[PDB]
Structure 1
């Protein structure tokens, strides 16, 4: 589809057997999701933006479905104020910017 940017580009995602709302974020290198108790091993990471850095858990090879488009890659989990789908997954679903 085509998503205009009058409002936040929020979509439903499926991850870890759960549905959530997440931002299609071209400014996010990585995908960052609200706290959730995913199974498996993880690695500590810190990511920064406006206001500073937060601590997150890095999970690799996680399956996410975005608007019916399947993707698999790294997902960071932590106390982020919003779920953001980053470029690592946006490329996998064929997402472009157009003007």
Structure 2
């Protein structure tokens, strides 16, 4: 589909057997989700944003379905105020900017 930018581009995602709302973010290199207790091994990581860095847990080869489009990649988990879908997964669903 096509998503205008009058409002935040929020969509429903399915991850780890749960449905959530997440922000399609062309300005994010990575995907960062609110605190959730995903299973499996993880690695510590620091991600920097506009106001500084936060600590996150890096999960690899995680499946996320975005508007029925499936994508598998690295998912970071930490105290982010908003679930963010970054380019690492947006590319996998064929997402583009158009103007």
Q: Same fold (TM over 0.5)?
A: yes
SS at match of 1:28: coil
In 2, Cα distance between equivalents of 1:17 and 1:98: 32
Instruction: Measure how far apart 1:51 and its partner are.
Output: 1.1
Instruction: Measure how far apart 1:94 and its partner are.
Output: 0.3
In 2, Cα distance between equivalents of 1:13 and 1:58: 18
Q: TM-score of the superposition, structure 2-length normalised?
A: 0.99
Q: How is 1:11-90 mapped onto 2 (pairs within 5 angstroms)?
A: 11-90=11-90
1:33-66 residue CA offsets vs partner (Å, 9 max, x unmatched): 0000000000000001111000000000000000
Instruction: Measure how far apart 1:5 and its partner are.
Output: 0.1
Instruction: Measure how far apart 1:4 and its partner are.
Output: 0.4
Large movers: runs of 4+ above 3 Å: none
In 2, Cα distance between equivalents of 1:8 and 1:17: 24
SS at match of 1:51: coil
In 2, Cα distance between equivalents of 1:66 and 1:15: 9
Aligned Cα root-mean-square deviation (Å): 0.3
Q: TM-score of the superposition, structure 1-length normalised?
A: 0.99
Instruction: Measure how far apart 1:82 and its partner are.
Output: 0.4
